Amino acid sequence: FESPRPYKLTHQVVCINNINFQRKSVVGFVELTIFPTVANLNRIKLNSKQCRIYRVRINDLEAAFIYNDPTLEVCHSESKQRNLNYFSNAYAAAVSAVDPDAGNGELCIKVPSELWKHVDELKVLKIHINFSLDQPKGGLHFVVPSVEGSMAERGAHVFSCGYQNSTRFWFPCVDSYSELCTWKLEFTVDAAMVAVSNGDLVETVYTHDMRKKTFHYMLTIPTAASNISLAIGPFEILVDPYMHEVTHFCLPQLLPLLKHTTSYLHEVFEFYEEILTCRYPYSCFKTVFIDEAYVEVAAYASMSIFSTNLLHSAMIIDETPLTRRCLAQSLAQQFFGCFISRMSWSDEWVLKGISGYIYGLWMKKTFGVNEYRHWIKEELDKIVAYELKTGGVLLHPIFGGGKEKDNPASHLHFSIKHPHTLSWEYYSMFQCKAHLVMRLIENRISMEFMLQVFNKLLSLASTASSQKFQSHMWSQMLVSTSGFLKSISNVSGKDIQPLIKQWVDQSGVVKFYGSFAFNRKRNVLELEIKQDYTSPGTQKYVGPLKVTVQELDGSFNHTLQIEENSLKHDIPCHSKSRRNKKKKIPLMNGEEVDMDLSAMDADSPLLWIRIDPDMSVLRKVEFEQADFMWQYQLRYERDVVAQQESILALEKFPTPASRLALTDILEQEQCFYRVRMSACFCLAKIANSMVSTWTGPPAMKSLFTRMFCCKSCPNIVKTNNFMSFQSYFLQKTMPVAMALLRDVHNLCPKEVLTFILDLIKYNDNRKNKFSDNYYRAEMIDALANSVTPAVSVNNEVRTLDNLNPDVRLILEEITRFLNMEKLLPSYRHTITVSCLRAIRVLQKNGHVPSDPALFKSYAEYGHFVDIRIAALEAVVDYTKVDRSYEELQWLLNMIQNDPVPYVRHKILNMLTKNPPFTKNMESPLCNEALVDQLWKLMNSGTSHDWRLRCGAVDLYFTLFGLSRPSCL
């Protein structure tokens, strides 16, 4: 109910002063107003790192000072137990001891006996701490362009990105969540550079009248400490006119990009207050764009600060989803970092659950309900893929208290009480399972009842906030899992605790071997299907559910399920649909018009099998039908889920020409965008099986012929095929699938190669007002998908033939596009990213030799994030395939030494995803000194961020995981 934490807190005043750009330091004093709880509270603990305190003071009395860092290395630096398990357990216990959720110590000021007698008299105190941040090595960021003479004034900015508990790294506090406080914030800033944090503009004139300004932001609204961040430097734009109080802060020469970017946000506010039945529960809302991003999502109190990658300036069409997608994320996680709050790390999952569900509801009534279901399919793809890679993602209410583990989910790391042990794969699937558990709450409880629940939560939050700090009656904003469950059961009490003990408290992905049997094939038994499941390693036995069957022309049959899963079950049978030449359309689904006796329609009243088409269960369903039923699903079905799962099932085995015909019929209608992308991939995989069975034409030429008429297109489609984004996505996708069309003689895509060359010839001027960039990028990706691995028979790598014959033309085109984007550049060098992927594929086919020096020169510092991340993916795969130890040493040294966090994040991420030095396959000899240097990089040099040593924990998961590394 209540927090197990003494020393309640009310007020805190920050005052940043003397912020430097040359020695790059910060000095400041912080002010805490504290009501202690119990007597003999002598060793009062706060917590921070990289903070040299100048002095501490309580009412003109400098007391004692304790400053420890057990977040650093093991207490013996040469602890020979250099394995995963001992380091994981010792680090979990050590950083739990860093956490003040016990009698612990990181910053323990000792109360003297005089002030102890004062605590015996009055438990009301004030804390004044003068301190100084150095050159910030994990707590702030000083983005400075390398000029330093004049453009350090105009062109640089100062901010703080970080994780949830990164407030420790910036200014000293408690465990930085779950301390409902109020703040006064004093900012010694430049006259041009504007400081952006929480609260309100409560005292701002040209302040202190000497040379600079000083900002007073007061946060009276009670939040936690894990919401404060200070962006200094950008320029003010009000993009108000619809709701009059939305403020934005961005760097100069980026301002009409904001004038296009911000709008449609008022619609998101309108829909969120249709959901919540309130107002926006603040004064105003702030947004800062910045050329760095620890997290792309990041959402704080009345303020969203994230990357200058999401502008999307009116011509750059393929961020039409992404921009307001990330804005919806940075409003939802905003709303649930503001008021509703966890009591512990194990109690969080409700928050990001309801936030992801709220921006999913936003994705419902803004764009693409079928794309919304496709996003749910991508969520299931992510969850099934990761929890078949690794174990489950469990949502604990249960602790390991009493030095206990209780962790079957400890295949790698600790998960119960602590954030900074987890991986971003685990964190992403935490959010993904939060999405789908909220969809299970949809599946058992009505949406209107959820609106009632959420209105009750925000009613208790807004009533408990903005008051005179009611003593002992103020922690109602801690709305964690237990009381939230009680509120749901008060609204509608059902079997939601079985839903918890299934999906919240048993982290398992469930496959489904629902074996199709065929009764009423003029049979004695009537329409029966067997249920079966067993697949251990990561399995789960889920019982009572329902099953959806569509008839030929008839009812949605729904059938119960049972536990003890060696089962046989029935169907609420259709009539005997006989004389079906007369029974043409007896109401299939409304007024849909379809006629085929082409199936096995002698004695078959069934068409399709389905288990929960609204996608309740974390599922991977495996079964078999007749192939005619699968192909008849792809002429029309009212589920994009059914369409793309039949697309996968018909990507596996078949090759008739009627499949190609029905695929081309499905691709020429108004059905869906990405269904046709994966259907062109069906055409690719099936025409790859047309080596000896080349019955049709060379495919997908007639699809460009019969669908696109500019001026009737005399054999060639050239100009101005836009303003219909169906054709935009389709022309973006299809030549990539055309480049896969291969029959095995030399795989011979020569007509397709020349056709793609002719398409690259025929680009448009400014008649298209749509910045023809991604079309070029995916055609270069089709050139990358022109993999020809079998040219170098003996030695043709090293400028022998000036290698021949079409590879040289592809080199000409990628040279042209690289130098055009060196001269033109149009939007982020995305063409250069596709070209570098093409150059790596050519290095993987032995045409351009395996040399990292181009990728080395594009992994340098002063480039864009995407260029650098593509070159780093390239050099990670280079270290995987080739035996380059020296570039791995440089890669680890740049993991140690660079100021950008996200490139380190993604180096570690896709170094874990694409590993060299593979466990129990050790030919390049990691045992020599690489185990030692990786152990050092886990211990030392990684006190900057938590996630970098989390990625290093992922590295030792991949590299020599549950054993000694076979050194000694």
Binding site: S146, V147, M151, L251, R808, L811, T815, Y827, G862
Partner: peptide, 22 residues
Amino acid sequence: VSTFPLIAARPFTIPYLTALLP
């Protein structure tokens, strides 16, 4: 020098004002 003399990397100070300019 004859066939494919690709332009080497510049890397310069401020990437976001250049690579995000219409």
